[PDB]
Amino acid sequence: GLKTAQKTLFPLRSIDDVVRLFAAELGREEPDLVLLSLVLGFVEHFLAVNRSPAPDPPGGLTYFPVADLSIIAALYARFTAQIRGAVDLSLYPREGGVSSRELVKKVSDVIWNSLSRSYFKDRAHIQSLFSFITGTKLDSSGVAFAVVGACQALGLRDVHLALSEDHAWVVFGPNGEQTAEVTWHGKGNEDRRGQTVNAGVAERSWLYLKGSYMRCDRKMEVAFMVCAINPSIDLHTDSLELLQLQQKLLWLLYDLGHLERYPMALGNLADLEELEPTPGRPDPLTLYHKGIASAKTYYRDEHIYPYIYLAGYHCRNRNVREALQAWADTATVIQDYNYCREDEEIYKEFFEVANDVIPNLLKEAASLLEAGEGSALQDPECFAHLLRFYDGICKWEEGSPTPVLHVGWATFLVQSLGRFEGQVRQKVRITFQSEKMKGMKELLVATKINSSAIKLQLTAQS
């Protein structure tokens, strides 16, 4: 049952009306996760899922799907009735505002058992409670979010969303010290629903961030649903309206302090600001730096994406030195992880940096150097950043249950090395931490680069 103060801000007829609803909910101690997620999913459904005067507006039309109270109230009542109907709190000895693992598992099972048996896990627009209620489809992290929403609907104030950079689960109990898996991760992995994350933290996988993962409060859970907005209409086109809505909502959260402990939300906001800068706001670079400051302050500098967001920006702006330094800093965080079997998404990022982005950046630099025959390619410190990147990757691989380096990496390493003259490479000042790079130090600086020797040494398993 929606309170009177919630009803008076319907109907929603614009992006600013949505922003106003978020503003009002975020002024409460319990922003209503179910109401806000239903609204975002409704809007995304109709802007993305179900997508002499000029004969059509010459600058295009933008659209907004009117959200009537009668529609949103009906979806809300359906969700709350399903959860309250399925969970008898009197059956769950819950001593002093701490939920039991058995109660968290019950709520989790109610969400899980409601889902359609068959759908693609990478399907777009199945993140929201709108998708849950109207299509019985949720994506992996959508299940975790829906468990937290369901727990809020039951008054279980201790159940919160936990987030790594690629996975979601719940924290509960006194001080949020208990953990439970509530959803799947990846494809064809062992079912760990119900389990703690203690094994994941101990194994030093990126997926569990060595325990430096996000423990959300209710306001951060609102920030999560805003980052979860998916503007994609199809493979090659985005809803401008959903980008603008996400941008405005992230600025609201920013102003209220709710992105302070949310590095990826700051990087998301920086990316939107690069697309369309907001008058009077910090520039993207300031926001990427705030993301890194957040990771340093709250997460022991154990996050990878803050550095990837920054390096990406420098790449797009042809800041060759700064991009290489940021990719070096990325590798310096990953080297203190072990590459585990559910870490593939961050492997994909390092693969793309090593084998595509760095080669294209150094190629652009080679073209600049040619035109008017000081370049990053003539700078030993820039070469040192390239080597520090590879050193971090090699150190990440050490002690890991899955290999990282393959002969394909060696091809790109040889191409990247060859962008720097022998006399520049021979001036490099570096101490390596990885056995592989220590072993390869003569090959990396040789005037004539030996591709066969670099391939053998980079890909050794020994």
Ligand X SMILES: CCN(C(=O)c1cc(F)ccc1Oc1cncnc1N1CC2(CCN(C[C@H]3CC[C@H](NS(=O)(=O)CC)CC3)CC2)C1)C(C)C
Binding characters for a copy of itself, 20-59, by CB under 8 A (x = yes): -------------------------xx--xx-xxxxxxxx
For residue 455 the two structure tokens come to 């391939």
460 Cβ contact list (under 8 Å, min separation 6): 436
Binding characters for a copy of itself, 54-73, by CB under 8 A (x = yes): xxxxxxxxxxxxxxx--x--
* Member of 13, 316, 318, 348 binding ligand X (CB under 6 A): 316
State the Cα–Cα distance between residues 286 and 307, nearest whole angstrom.
Answer: 13
DSSP conformation class of 12: B
Angle at 175 between CA 202 and CA 301, to 5 degrees: 50
Please state the closest distance from residue 291 (CB atom) to ligand X, in A: 10
Q: Which is nearer to a copy of itself, 69 or 446 (CB)?
A: 69
Residue 370's CB is within 10 A of a number of other CB atoms, namely 9
Q: Which is nearer to a copy of itself, 120 or 370 (CB)?
A: 120
State the Cα–Cα distance between residues 290 and 452, nearest whole angstrom.
Answer: 43
Q: Which of ligand X, a copy of itself, none has residue 222 at its interface (CB below 5 to 8 Å by kind)? A: none
Residue 201's CB is within 10 A of a number of other CB atoms, namely 17
Please state the closest distance from residue 165 (CB atom) to ligand X, in A: 6
Helix axes 218-227 and 140-153, enclosed angle (nearest 10): 140
Please state the closest distance from residue 64 (CB atom) to a copy of itself, in A: 5
Please state the closest distance from residue 161 (CB atom) to ligand X, in A: 9
Tell me if 69 contacts ligand X by CB under 6 A.
no
Residue type, 410: A
Point out which span in 86-94, 150-158, 263-271, 294-302 binds ligand X (CB under 6 A): 263-271
Please state the closest distance from residue 262 (CB atom) to ligand X, in A: 7
Binding characters for ligand X, 158-177, by CB under 6 A (x = yes): -----xxxxxx---------
Tell me if 315 contacts ligand X by CB under 6 A.
yes
Q: Which is nearer to ligand X, 92 or 298 (CB)?
A: 298
Which residue(s) pair with 214 in the sheet?
A: 163
State the Cα–Cα distance between residues 89 and 103, nearest whole angstrom.
Answer: 8
| Torsion sign (Cα): 169, 160, 67, 1 | positive
State the Cα–Cα distance between residues 2 and 7, nearest whole angstrom.
Answer: 7
Q: Could you list the residues that contact ligand X (CB under 6 A)?
A: 127, 141, 163-168, 224, 227-228, 264-265, 268, 305, 308-309, 312, 315-316, 349, 352-353, 357
